[PDB]
Amino acid sequence: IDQKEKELIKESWKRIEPNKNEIGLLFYANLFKEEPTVSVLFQNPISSQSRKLMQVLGILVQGIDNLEGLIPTLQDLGRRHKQYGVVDSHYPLVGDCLLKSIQEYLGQGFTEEAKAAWTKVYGIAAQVMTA
Amino acid sequence: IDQKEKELIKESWKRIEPNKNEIGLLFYANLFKEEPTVSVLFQNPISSQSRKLMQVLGILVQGIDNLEGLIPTLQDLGRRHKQYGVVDSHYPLVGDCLLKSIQEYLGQGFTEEAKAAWTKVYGIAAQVMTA
């Protein structure tokens, strides 16, 4: 992640954050339609789940200048995901769906350059989570 | 529906409406989780679909004192639904899921009395759409 990518993340988050509740919920709707098999893994209220996901995305943005500082928390999160029945192959599907959902909700407000930066940040988070 | 029910619809809409985008999106997530098969019927972006659904709920509220007046609109809507592949048994599924989603998102802010009124209104709408 270069300084240009870090900037795009911070800038796009200013448009994501005010829309975070809707984006998170759209993401679940899209995920469950795209991959009908994974919805069985989500066993708590989706409203609450969405808030948790978007909170962590916020934490990634807040620490975007030092992501290594987040290795521990991301490792713990990946470990809990194993306990939820999540496997490595789920991660690209969720990443694709999340990025497509942000794109859908924000439209032109979300640039290709921003989407590319978020792709890399997600890939990094998923790498740490799956070890 | 009776006068008290009409009032409950109007008053409870004051809490539903400001949250309507979130409730709509949560509804599709819950719907697609509960019955993954229906998600194939939804061909257009879910963000736009949720807005359309919540627009019609708003119309039901606007017309709540004279639902008889909306019968032609609801009949047209029901006719279009048939074309989408929607069938009678889908209506209770959608109704249950919609009410549960409003309940989930608002928590105790969605009163037992308001929920009972909304249950009856959805039932009426469903009946007109499918008659």
Ligand code: HEM
């Ligand atoms: C960057 C990637 C991801 C992030 C930031 C993330 C974030 C979270 C968070 C914050 C929670 C709350 C529970 C906890 O903290 O342990 C959670 C739970 C969960 N996540 Fe993820 N997640 C990611 C990827 C995935 C993937 C790929 C899946 C695959 C389906 C997934 C499925 C689940 C499930 C099933 C739960 C538990 C739901 C329940 O409580 O029943 N997550 N995730």
Ligand code: HEM
């Ligand atoms: C119960 C009250 C319902 C209301 C108020 C409602 C509202 C709407 C509205 C406003 C549209 C936009 C298109 C149009 O106006 O014709 C729509 C489309 C649609 N509805 Fe409903 N609906 C209801 C019930 C259902 C049910 C029970 C199903 C069963 C799955 C369903 C599935 C669909 C599908 C598949 C579409 C088309 C999506 C697309 O554009 O591909 N709806 N609905």
